[PDB]
């Protein structure tokens, strides 16, 4: 049963610096600034039809578009590049490039010099925007969610996706890889079940991942491959929708099908809650892994039936950090949190009911 898209939202994505988000819909595409929450432009159904995927390149005029939903003008096997800064009387003049494949596109990732196209069992990497050429192609395990993350750093060209072994990650340095050569992806055995979420931090020094069990989030150093931390979202299984780092890598947020967004401290791990059993010192040989688990510093609730992406906002002050949740039901949630674990709603809006203020 494909859940009918709540309010017609088919996909949600933050841009690379989490400062904008894009919304693919049954009625086209919408682009929002996160702080302040404001519509920055849309593509209507008359321009693009129903859309399955949108990815924005940073804060530029370049969008990668994949047709999908109930009434698409474009194929689910084509990635179209829209250039919104092009003057043209016809919407077709803003379509600057097309990448066509033999299977449906499940995710697109962009950075300043590259576009990455994810199919169910293959990942393609091209140079972008100028004179696009295929640089690399990678085989994957069954990747039906298009799971891939691409480091946005100028200094590191790290790609991460699900590896061939169940619950493994493959990491590829695209700068160290000669074009047309297989630089061997290095493998991290992150989980025992299939990967559900993966994210890199901004410098590409740390990878976070969660499996389909969604009880644990594991962080690894991307160079040494060592497990840095194991975070516990909950006791109970949960489908994670999103995991993201803060810009400074001090925190990690995680959204799930429990209607909860969890916040973890990564830099000062003492801010994370620990099980009370960890204070009842080492009584017996079998409780060791539950005692060392770090629980969320803070958490807040969102509508439980609404899938949501989560990210960090801009630091408003020296000790107050913000987390945004964008939900497929059209709701925007902003929470402020502090190192003592207080977490309070700062803003709530219905981002789909934000019209362009054609009044000023």
């Amino acid at each position: 049963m494909t859940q009918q898209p709540l309010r017609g939202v088919t996909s949600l994505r933050f841009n690379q610096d989490q400062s904008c988000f894009c919304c693919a819909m049954e009625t086209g595409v919408r682009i929002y600034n996160v702080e302040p929450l404001m519509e920055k432009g849309h593509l209507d159904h008359e321009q693009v039809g129903s859309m399955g995927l949108v990815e924005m390149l940073h804060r530029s005029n370049l969008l990668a578009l994949v047709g999908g939903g109930s009434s698409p003008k474009f194929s689910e096997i084509s990635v179209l590049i829209w250039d919104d800064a092009r003057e043209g009387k016809d919407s077709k003049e803003k379509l600057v490039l097309e990448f066509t494949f033999t299977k449906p596109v499940l995710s697109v990732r962009m950075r300043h010099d590259k576009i990455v196209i994810v199919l169910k069992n293959r990942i393609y990497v091209y140079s972008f925007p100028d004179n696009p050429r295929k640089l690399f192609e990678f085989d994957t395990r069954d990747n039906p969610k298009g799971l891939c993350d691409l480091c946005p750093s100028l200094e590191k060209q790290l790609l991460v996706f699900p590896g061939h072994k169940c619950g493994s990650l493959q990491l590829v340095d695209l700068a160290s890889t000669k074009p047309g050569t297989s630089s061997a992806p290095f493998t991290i055995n992150a989980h025992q079940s299939d990967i559900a979420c993966v994210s890199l931090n901004q410098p590409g020094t740390v990878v976070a991942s969660a499996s389909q069990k969604g009880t644990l989030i594991r962080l690894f150093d991307t160079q040494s491959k060592e497990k840095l931390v194991e975070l516990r979202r909950g006791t109970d299984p949960a489908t994670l929708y999103c995991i993201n780092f803060s810009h400074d890598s001090s925190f990690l947020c995680a959204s799930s099908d429990k209607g909860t967004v969890h916040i973890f401290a990564l830099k000062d791990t003492r801010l994370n809650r620990r099980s009370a059993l960890a204070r009842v010192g080492k009584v017996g040989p079998m409780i060791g892994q539950y005692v060392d688990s770090q629980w969320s510093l803070a958490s807040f609730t969102v509508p439980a039936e609404s899938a949501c992406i989560c990210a960090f906002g801009r630091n408003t002050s020296k000790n107050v950090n913000s987390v945004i949740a964008i939900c497929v039901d059209g709701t925007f949630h902003k929470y402020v949190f502090t190192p003592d674990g207080n977490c309070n709603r700062e803003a709530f809006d219905v981002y789909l009911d934000i019209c362009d203020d054609d009044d000023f």
Binding site: R86, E87, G88, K89, D90, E93
Partner: protein
């Protein structure tokens, strides 16, 4: 003493009559010219001897008492001529068979006679008693042969009695049943009424009673037949005895005269106000004519003819006043000295008997089948009285009262006309070698016929004054060979008009408005007014298949045209659909038209070739319009799906053409705009410019939608080199205010001859076209990464190199501010 010494004696008592020479009620006072003065009065043909064994119960009414003194009793036995006081008796019994057989048997010498007063015979087939009383002097059913002053010379050459009789007087034959509805002949003086050879009834002449009666009456005077109710009431009383009510002889009936006053009225009889046909028709004081040829037996196995001839007969027809007043035929034709004359022929065949080449043979076959007829051969009649109206009177009489005259005889008939010169008086008759046709019930089935028309005319002659004098230029003109296959059960008017105006010029718009055209459409326009009996007016419906082949149009008048020449080849208005309706499919399949322009816009224009240079020719234009007044619900969907428009020109030629045009609701064309070879040669193409104006974009979308706008060439170069303004170059895709561009890989490649050569072309244009006035948000993008190679000067110097303007919602243009919007900011590349 009144010695009565005579009675019935031995004689050949006929079947129908008793041979009994009785001198009754007469004092027979008898007191080699041996004269016994007597009184033979009372000879009676009581007759009826055959029926009912002499019909003794009812003796016949026809009987004569005191039927002439005949006292003189001239001459005796020997040319036994007798000068008498008794004219003759009348056998009122059937004068076709019984009386004829009695006379033949009695006759079985060259005796003459000279009677006195011409008894009023009343042979019907006590009136015969009146005939006997008139012999003593000598409404209907009043057949009377009474020469008042009988000059009868009974030649009676019995040597098979080849008899004869020449008289100097005539009868008065109201021939009627056994409203003045019968003939009223009044011939009377010898030439005035030259009655000749009335009866033969002898086996010598023919071998009824074998008459062969050549009653070739040759009179030469008035002899007025004042009234004649019908021709048919004449065939019945001659073939049958008679079947009217209150309401092996070969009769050769010849009649020639210079003058014999006459009336002709049609036959409209109940059996087969007045008669509808030809109201008040008189062949007044024409030639005598009306010469017939009949037979005693009904349903004549041999055909029946009825001829006529007249030089310039002044026959006032349908009189107000005649529609044609004189035969006026001075038309010598043969190598020898000939003078053509008119004729009205008739050829009746027994009932139930047995396009130069198409129209002729079809109606020849229709003439071989006769249940009625009519025929005319008018060489140059063309006549009309000074009081006449071809537009109105001819319509009102000779088209309504034409076929509804009880057409049947023993309704498959025919009709022909033939004129070497015609005049449609009141107006461009132009008539030479023309005809008119008509048929009824072709092959026996009602609804099938062959209506036709032919001529050869000069095209357009105007009226009040002076003629237009068009057609200064082996099918014939106005070959309107229409076809009709209407159905009596449907009871609706169907037309299959295969019109053909060959090499004509059918324009009548004389003045600046269609004035003489208005006159033509007020005179000619009348759709077969048919109030006659048996035809309640069927609802009119027209299905044309016209062919205006080679109808050149070069004299279309306006305020100030310049000897405009448009040489069409075929104008095939083959409207297979009904025109008189909301929808009308009209396949204008033209074949290779052209156009030629004269010298100078001011009306007077002369040049070496008036068939001047070509300006705008068309290879083919299949404007298949379906006007709904392609399933396009919008009214008047003029889907002119034109094929292509070639155009060739020089700067002077197109400048002059533009001056000519200046001085003188879906529309989805999808029509190629120009394969323009346009002294200079510079090819330009515009393929599939689907300018569907007002197609939708809500109001007059008018999308240029130019599928290809490649400006093939300019300057002096005629070879194609890609200049610009599949491609879908909707340069003028509009709304209500928009524009676009096709982003072609290379648009402006200007390195050929002089890019300003089109600028000097525009200079020569403003020199030719003396008046040159134009010297939501638009988003009027140029939308092409221009691969280029004074703006023209810089393009020439540089000959990618430029960029597309992308004027999103600029609105820099205002119809005159397009240059202003183009001048916004600045741009340069490479």
């Amino acid at each position: 003493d009144t010695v009565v010494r005579v009675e019935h004696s031995p004689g050949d008592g006929e079947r129908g009559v008793a041979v009994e020479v009785r001198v009754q009620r007469l004092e027979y006072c008898d007191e080699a010219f041996l004269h016994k003065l007597l009184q033979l009065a009372g000879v009676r043909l009581h007759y009826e001897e055959l029926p009912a064994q002499e019909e003794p119960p009812e003796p016949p009414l026809q009987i004569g008492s005191c039927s002439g003194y005949m006292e003189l009793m001239v001459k005796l036995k020997q040319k036994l001529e007798v000068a008498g006081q008794l004219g003759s008796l009348h056998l009122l019994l059937t004068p076709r068979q019984l009386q004829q057989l009695q006379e033949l048997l009695s006759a079985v010498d060259s005796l003459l006679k000279m009677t006195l007063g011409g008894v009023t015979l009343t042979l019907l087939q006590l009136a015969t008693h009146f005939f006997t009383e008139f012999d003593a002097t000598k409404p209907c059913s009043h057949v009377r042969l009474t020469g008042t002053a009988v000059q009868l010379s009974w030649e009676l050459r019995t040597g098979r009695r080849t008899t004869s009789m020449e008289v100097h007087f005539g009868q008065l034959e109201v021939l009627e049943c056994l409203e003045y509805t019968e003939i009223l002949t009044f011939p009377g003086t010898r030439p005035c009424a030259h009655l000749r050879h009335t009866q033969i009834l002898r086996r010598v002449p023919k071998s009824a009673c074998h008459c062969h009666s050549e009653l070739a009456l040759d009179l030469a005077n008035f002899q007025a037949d004042v009234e004649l109710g019908a021709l048919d009431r004449l065939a019945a009383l001659l073939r049958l005895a008679t079947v009217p009510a209150e309401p092996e002889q070969q009769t050769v009936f010849r009649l020639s005269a210079p003058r014999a006053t006459l009336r002709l009225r049609f036959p409209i009889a109940d059996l087969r106000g007045q008669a509808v046909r030809a109201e008040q028709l008189r062949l007044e004081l024409s030639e005598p004519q009306f010469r017939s040829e009949l037979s005693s037996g009904p349903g004549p196995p041999v055909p029946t003819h009825l001829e006529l001839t007249c030089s310039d007969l002044h026959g006032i027809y349908e009189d107000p006043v005649p529609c044609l007043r004189v035969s006026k035929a001075l038309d010598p034709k043969s190598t020898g000295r000939k003078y053509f004359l008119p004729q009205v022929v008739v050829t009746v065949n027994p009932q139930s008997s047995s396009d130069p080449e198409e129209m002729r043979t079809f109606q020849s076959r229709t003439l071989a089948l006769s249940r009625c007829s009519l025929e005319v051969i008018l060489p140059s009649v063309h006549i009309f009285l000074p009081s006449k109206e071809v537009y109105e009177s001819i319509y009102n009489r000779i088209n309504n009262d034409l076929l509804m005259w009880e057409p049947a005889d023993l309704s498959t008939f025919s009709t022909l006309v033939t004129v070497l010169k015609g005049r449609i008086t009141a107006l461009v008759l132009d008539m030479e070698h023309g005809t008119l046709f008509s048929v009824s019930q072709y092959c026996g089935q009602p609804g099938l016929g062959y209506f036709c028309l032919e001529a050869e005319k000069a095209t357009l002659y105007h009226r009040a004054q002076l003629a237009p004098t068009i057609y200064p230029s082996g099918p014939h003109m106005l070959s309107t060979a229409v076809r009709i296959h209407l159905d009596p059960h449907k009871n609706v008017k169907e037309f299959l008009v295969t019109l053909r105006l060959h090499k004509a010029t059918l324009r009548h718009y004389m003045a600046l408005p269609e004035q003489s055209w208005h006159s033509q459409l007020l005179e000619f326009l009348d759709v077969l007014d048919d109030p006659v009996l048996g035809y309640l007016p069927p609802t009119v419906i027209t299905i044309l298949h016209t062919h205006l082949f080679s109808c050149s149009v070069d004299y279309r008048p306006l305020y100030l045209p310049v000897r405009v020449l448009i040489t069409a080849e075929t104008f095939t208005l083959s409207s297979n659909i009904i025109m008189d309706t909301s929808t009308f499919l009209l396949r204008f399949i033209l074949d290779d038209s052209a156009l030629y322009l004269s010298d100078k816009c001011e009306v007077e224009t002369l040049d070496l070739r008036r068939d001047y240079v070509c300006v705008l020719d068309v290879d083919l234009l299949e404007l298949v319009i379906k006007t709904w007044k392609k399933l396009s619900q919008p009214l008047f969907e003029l889907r002119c799906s034109n094929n292509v428009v070639h155009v060739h020109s020089c700067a002077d030629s197109c400048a002059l053409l533009v001056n000519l045009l200046q001085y003188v609701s879906t529309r989805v064309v999808l029509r190629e705009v120009s394969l323009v070879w346009h002294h200079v040669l510079m090819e330009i193409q515009l393929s599939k410019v689907s300018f569907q104006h007002e197609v939708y974009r809500p109001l007059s979308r008018q999308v240029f939608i130019v599928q290809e706008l490649e400006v093939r060439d300019r300057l002096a170069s005629s070879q194609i080199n890609k200049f610009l303004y599949s491609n879908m170059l909707t340069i003028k895709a509009l709304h209500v205010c928009c524009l676009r561009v096709s982003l072609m890989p290379l648009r402006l490649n200007v390195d050929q001859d002089a890019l300003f050569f089109l600028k000097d072309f525009f200079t020569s244009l403003v020199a030719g076209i003396n008046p040159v006035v134009p010297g939501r948000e638009f988003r009027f993008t140029s939308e092409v990464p221009i691969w280029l190679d004074t703006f023209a000067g810089l393009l020439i110097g540089l000959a990618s190199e430029l960029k597309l303007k992308r004027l999103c919602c600029r609105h820099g243009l205002l119809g005159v501010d397009k240059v202003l919007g183009y001048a916004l900011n600045e741009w340069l590349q490479d």
